[PDB]
Structure 1
Amino acid sequence: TAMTVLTPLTEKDYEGLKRVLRSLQAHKMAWPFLEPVDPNDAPDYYGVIKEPMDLATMEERVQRRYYEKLTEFVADMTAIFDNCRYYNPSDSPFYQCAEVLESFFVQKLKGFKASRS
């Protein structure tokens, strides 16, 4: 509840983060976010989007124990959805994927915070 802000992530916590990440990676609507955006697919993306993010980058960061607090992990995840909704139009498949996957992420996140306490 404020644990998210102040309590340093533990190894036990990281098992949970990995589980959440795996659940997102397995979601059928997560397909656009699995890997970094391909420049060939979206020629102007990396000029528009200043802080790109993707689930593989986050997998790497989880592996390296990059996050010290839950808020940092959550901010990285939110960057994915925000980037998506900013770059794509509201009637795009990508945009829809962002909506679904973010609601899913919130459900899982609540799960994790509850398990944490």
Structure 2
Amino acid sequence: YDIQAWKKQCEELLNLIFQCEDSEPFRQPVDLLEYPDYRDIIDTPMDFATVRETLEAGNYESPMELCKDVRLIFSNSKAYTPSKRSRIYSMSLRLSAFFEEHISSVLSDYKSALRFHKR
């Protein structure tokens, strides 16, 4: 029932994501010189360094907010892909499965801890 435990859990999950080769295209903002039309399709760019910096700045109140930003990395990849068989998008799908597998207990434990706090 530790209301604050999600933060270190998210830091460790981000460390695992950075060690994963599938995160390479998503570790820093999409390079607008390499993809000049990126902002014509994507309204809100997001990447794992921005997520880690937001967390470290104390700018996430809950793991649900971090999860919304991580999911935005994957939805941006899906929206920008010219094909469902593209390399970067295919890496996003595996990384998304890995993230969802690991974030599930972080969200469950936090929501349970908050319910206990407000019992």
TM-score bracket for this pair, using the shorter chain length: 0.7 to 0.9
The equivalent residue for 2:12 is 19
The equivalent residue for 1:62 is 55
Out of 46, 49, 65, the residue aligned to residue 42 of structure 2 is 49
Q: Deviation above 6 Å: which 4+ runs of structure 1? A: none
Q: Which aligned pairs between 1:1-117 and structure 2 lie closer than 5 A?
A: 10=4, 12-88=5-81, 89-113=83-107, 116=110
**Which of these two proteins has the greater Rg computed from alpha carbons?**
2
Unaligned runs of 5+ in 1: none
Q: How far apart are residue 110 of structure 1 and its match?
A: 2.0
Counterpart amino acid of residue 17 in structure 1: C
Q: How far apart are residue 65 of structure 1 and its match?
A: 1.3
- Greater mean deviation of Cα atoms: 107-116 or 24-33: 107-116
Name the CA distance, whole Å, in 2 between partners of 1:38 and 1:58.
Answer: 17
Q: Deviation string for 1:67-96 (max 9, x for gaps)?
A: 112211110000000000110121110110
Give 3-state SS (helix, strand or coil) of 2:35's partner: coil
Q: How far apart are residue 115 of structure 1 and its match?
A: 5.5
Q: How far apart are residue 26 of structure 1 and its match?
A: 1.1
Give 3-state SS (helix, strand or coil) of 1:67's partner: coil
Aligned length: 110
Counterpart amino acid of residue 71 in structure 2: T
Give 3-state SS (helix, strand or coil) of 1:112's partner: helix
TM-score calculated relative to the size of structure 2: 0.83
Unaligned runs of 5+ in 2: 113-119
